[PDB]
Symmetry: D2
Subunit: 316 residues, 4 copies
Amino acid sequence: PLFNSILDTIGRTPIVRLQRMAPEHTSVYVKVESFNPGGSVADRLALSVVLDAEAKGLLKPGDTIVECTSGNVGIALAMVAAARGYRFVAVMGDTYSVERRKLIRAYGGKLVLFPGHLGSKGGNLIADELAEKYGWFRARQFDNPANPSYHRETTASEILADFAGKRLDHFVTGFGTTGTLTGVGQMLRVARPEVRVVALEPSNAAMLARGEWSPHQIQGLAPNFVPGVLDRSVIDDLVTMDEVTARDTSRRLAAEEGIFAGISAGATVATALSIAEHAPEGTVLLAMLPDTGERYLSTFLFDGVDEGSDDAWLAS
Amino acid sequence: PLFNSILDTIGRTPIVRLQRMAPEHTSVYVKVESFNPGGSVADRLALSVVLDAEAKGLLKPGDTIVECTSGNVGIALAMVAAARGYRFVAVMGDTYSVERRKLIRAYGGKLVLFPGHLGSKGGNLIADELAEKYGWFRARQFDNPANPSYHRETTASEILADFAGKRLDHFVTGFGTTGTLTGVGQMLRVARPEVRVVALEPSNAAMLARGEWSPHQIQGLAPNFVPGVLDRSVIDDLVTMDEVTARDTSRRLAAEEGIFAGISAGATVATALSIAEHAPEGTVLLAMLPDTGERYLSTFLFDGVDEGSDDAWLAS
Amino acid sequence: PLFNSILDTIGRTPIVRLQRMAPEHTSVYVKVESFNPGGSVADRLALSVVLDAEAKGLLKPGDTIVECTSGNVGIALAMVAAARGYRFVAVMGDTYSVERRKLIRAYGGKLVLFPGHLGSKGGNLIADELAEKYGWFRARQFDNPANPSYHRETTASEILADFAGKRLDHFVTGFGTTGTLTGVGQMLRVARPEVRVVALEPSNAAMLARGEWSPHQIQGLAPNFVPGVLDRSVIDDLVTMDEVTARDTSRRLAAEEGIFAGISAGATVATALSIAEHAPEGTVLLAMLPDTGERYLSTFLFDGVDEGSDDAWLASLDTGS
Amino acid sequence: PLFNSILDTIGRTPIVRLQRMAPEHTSVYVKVESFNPGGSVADRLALSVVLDAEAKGLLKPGDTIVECTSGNVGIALAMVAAARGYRFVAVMGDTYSVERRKLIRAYGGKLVLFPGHLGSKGGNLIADELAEKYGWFRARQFDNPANPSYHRETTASEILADFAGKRLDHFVTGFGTTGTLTGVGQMLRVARPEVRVVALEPSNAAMLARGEWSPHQIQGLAPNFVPGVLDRSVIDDLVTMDEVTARDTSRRLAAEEGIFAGISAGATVATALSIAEHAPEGTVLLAMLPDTGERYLSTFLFDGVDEGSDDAWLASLDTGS
Ligand SMILES: Cc1ncc(COP(=O)(O)O)c(/C=N/[C@@H](CONC(N)=O)C(=O)O)c1O
Ligand SMILES: Cc1ncc(COP(=O)(O)O)c(/C=N/[C@@H](CONC(N)=O)C(=O)O)c1O
Ligand SMILES: Cc1ncc(COP(=O)(O)O)c(/C=N/[C@@H](CONC(N)=O)C(=O)O)c1O
Ligand SMILES: Cc1ncc(COP(=O)(O)O)c(/C=N/[C@@H](CONC(N)=O)C(=O)O)c1O
């Protein structure tokens, strides 16, 4: 049926099965969040927070939304603001991919950059001062309950519906705000307590597991602090994945499965594959693919990529 | 429900209503083909041709598919080949966006570039020689019946279903192979003969309307010849749209409606808006949005875009 | 997502594969129209005619709609009328199942019965006379272009979308108004001309094939005249099917596949199975199942059905019969 | 897309807004479980218990399933059995509608009737005795965790997805096994604790509220015992609803909204309308409609329904009464 707003297409993303990448004795499925109009799982948060704000009477047309983002939320919030009539200002580290900057501008969002080495803790402070200075609305994605709640009601509902009456042993996800991890983990806990909730962190930014943090290349993951929305109790397995393995796995997904996703997507799949390798027969795992690989053409995901004609190849 | 192959998510794209861009006395809807896994309407063709080929016994695993493309079909065919186990070689003009080249490489496709000024006629000749030389399978998108047929069965079926029992006066589309135009126009003709099928061409490459052709910036449209699959009779209104107006309209779609699409998408919407302006009250129009704007960050769609912090703006 | 009206759930019915009834070398799929809110394919026509009439300014709130029906259209129009604020009067043969009378009544419809043996030809005259006397709107299901048109746009679109990129050899359907056969048949002609369009008639009511008609038991099919909306050119195979075989096939569907459908439904499947029997390996067929079997409890579909306890069966177990 | 089995169409039922029955300052939505292939919410339990049993190695092809049911579960298990290759035996009170007996029979199920006045307590004993004597599998719908679990994963997920980002104040449902109330109630507790969970019982069978039971007419609800799967903690409002009001509300739904549902369906809506009457403006309520009204043709839902021609009404028109 026809849709009124493009915002009505958010959510209800497909879960597809990996055809060759999974170890023969297992089944690995992936939730493709790039089907979201904004091209990432951040669409869920963006809509949730704005709708909740409107309901709270904190958002009026023409108002300005300011937020510290690693990219995807800035894009999504910019999209929502363009569609619903709000202004948007993204506070983002200068090391995040240029695509994110362009996409944010594409939806008409403003852009405030800052030294990426300060991490999200630094950006949050900036976004906070700005809001205080100009009276802008703060989305506070790392502390806003509307973040994980939307995941409890949609992301969780999609996964549970799709696997109803079916076997499912592991759910793998990385975390930025931990909204996805918390919201889905809290529903899994009640509906399917047997499913192991696996939470990975970049090997070089293992905050929860090692109290460590350093800039990294798995954009979207590991802020330099523990987010307020996180319900630590939902985690069964806390593991790490290195950014190079993540990059290499995203590549495999594209060339071996026809699925082009981001670095974090390659991280979760790589983790899922690791568990699968030494898991019992029949084991079924689900990994989240947060965004499209399209906003990573300028990153290390394409190191070594040949943009010229294959005259050498053809030579053979 | 769960999906087996990512290829099972092709088609069934949303048709959304423009909230502010349409003249108050009208309704403009848009079919967002960027929801296709490959991010463009080309996914329909790619799958169709490969499945038809397999059925014909012309395609076996490991076989190599070669095709002359303006980009999107190369990406899609590369995607399908990665998922189904085929090799792919794209013949593409060197003037098409770098994103297309990267995306094709992302799915593991080979890349053969040639002087863009030769247009698709030149690329077709190249792809043909290569296939003859190495025995590769030729998709022949400009002449393959499987191209418009898939549009007759899906694209057309989605539009008709969504508007069943509803008013619809104009259907707007541009054309490359003319597969979309032909296939949907042929079904509209039978089911809703009253709907005007509007076919636009770039002002500077009006082949059908003026027998003219010149390189242009509306990537995906106007090859330098009349495609074999074209059923000229389905066209009611043949109009032109300039590439700058198309670019400006795509921008508006993004910043005013939250819809980020390609140049051709801005072209069709601009045409639809033009008709709407001087159309009777109640007039309902549908325009196709062929692909995501994400593969256009390096094109003129972003001329003048500021990639730096808004210190100037903040200054105020 | 949430629906505003119950009428927004009309259409988009599932097509499912038969798991054990089809010959091994073939595949038989069925379109389950019982999934429509009204319980049958009639919902598509009812909504279409009403919407069309509204856009043409022929219908206004409180207006009365009258139609001669074999049952399902009466049920559907009643449902649409109840949802949209209209009054409905059904003109139905007295031999159609009582479930039909009760369903029409449930939605608030009125009932005008007439001697069934007169066929729909007789019913249309009554419907026409009532309209002229009271000014009621006539759906004219046998001549209204809005009938086959909704099938070209929805029923046909769902079928083509589901089979896109897949093998489909035969499309099987019976006909009453022929709106289904004409609407789908015409779209199939343009997009998949290779598909064989098979239209069956009851063995005892081969009106189109031989100009024969007699009251029959495959409720919903074969009126005693050739409907105006019919485009005979879409038919590749015009066959017959006897009511008993149809009845038995409906029974088999419910007990062997868990699909409970009406008589006309058993008819189409029966025909499809007949073609599948002598068809080449790989042959794929699609059969229409117009309605739920639940409005046939009082029909010969349940002749011999035991409503009592299986005391005898239970005893048959203890022993060694 | 194409479906392999009819059982793959179970669940994902539409939720629609009532257009004229709700008080102006409120919004009442209803979950239409009739859209399930079996015609009711029972399909979710039937599939779940069977799938669970299969994964636990408790069910093998040709195995026999036995269950005491008020009807719908018998119909559904019969349907699943017919589709999956199982044998089914229903143990049902003799007072439940004959449509239930016929439907079970249609899918190939067996029927064991017993004096209705004994309630499901009496039926379970019979079911248990039969199983022990013949080794049949017991679905144990009142104690099987697979019941409420399928509701947490599907029914609740559909509700939450549809209302995500939207206002929802009350969730209304009655209960038989309480699987629906417990499964949905528990997920609502975690995701939307603000939503008021309203569970009603028949005025004459307030077993949970006052420990009272008497045979009643709201078929499907209130067994004469408190089910083991019940998690009483999910209930915020425990109310009653009389069968007549429920019956009248089902009538109103079909005639005023074009939605034809059973008695328990009329009950939930009635309760919801009652709460809506004195609720603040903007209040949004959701009511469960467990099944189609088509298996109630022989019940008091149709008391006073005229199966004859409206000759009198037609005459009433010509005159000036
Ligand atoms: C590609 C990708 N993968 C996984 C996640 C994590 O999702 P959440 O845990 O937030 O739910 C995100 C989050 N992206 C959010 C938060 O990232 N900010 C950080 N880490 O400081 C944003 O766009 O601002 C992501 O962009
Ligand atoms: C962005 C966008 N918009 C509209 C169309 C036209 O669609 P069709 O007429 O082919 O169905 C296309 C076609 N893209 C095809 C054909 O383009 N080749 C040309 N024109 O020489 C390809 O990717 O190779 C497109 O990439
Ligand atoms: C159970 C079932 N099966 C097949 C068909 C045929 O569908 P159509 O050819 O009309 O599209 C119908 C038609 N039912 C219509 C027309 O029936 N009138 C006749 N045949 O005299 C009605 O209810 O009025 C049906 O109720
Ligand atoms: C029409 C309708 N409405 C509501 C419910 C209650 O649903 P549950 O609470 O069991 O989930 C049911 C249950 N029907 C079940 C249980 O009924 N047995 C009782 N109550 O003694 C069955 O068919 O066996 C129903 O058939």
